[PDB]
């Protein structure tokens, strides 16, 4: 069984990678940077929707909304296809809070 980590990178290899850019790539493995970081022997069938809200939250420091919008949709995908192969069962993407808190963007005046 592999993990999330392995998983989204040989998920994109395999099928994004002919349609996408080397341009493409940096924003893939750099999110992969981030999904390695957290979930290293964490197997792609048992993120929590939990944890997963906590790792948007600390994306969302250090990258813009874009960054972090199309991340989520990575995984989207990434799970939806591991679902559609029947491999996956959680898709923790109900808490897929894109907070780029970058720009959390609130009323701070008195």
């Known amino acids: 069984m592999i993990t999330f980590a392995d998983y989204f990178y ?3 290899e395999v099928n994004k990678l002919p349609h996408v850019s080397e341009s493409t790539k940096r924003h893939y493995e750099s999110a992969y940077k ?3 970081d957290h979930f290293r022997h964490k197997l792609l069938k048992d993120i929590k929707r939990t944890e ?3 790792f948007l939250n600390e994306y969302g420091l250090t990258h ?3 960054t972090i919008r199309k991340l989520n949709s990575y995984i989207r995908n990434a799970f939806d296809d ?3 192969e029947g491999y996956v069962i959680k898709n923790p993407t109900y ?3 894109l907070h780029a808190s970058v720009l959390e963007h609130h009323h701070h005046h008195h």
């Open 64 to 66: 813009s909304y874009e």
């Open 34 to 36: 981030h999904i390695k």
């Open 95 to 97: 808490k897929a809070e």
């Open 52 to 54: 997963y809200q906590k």
């Open 82 to 84: 591991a679902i559609h």
């Open 10 to 12: 040989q998920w994109y």
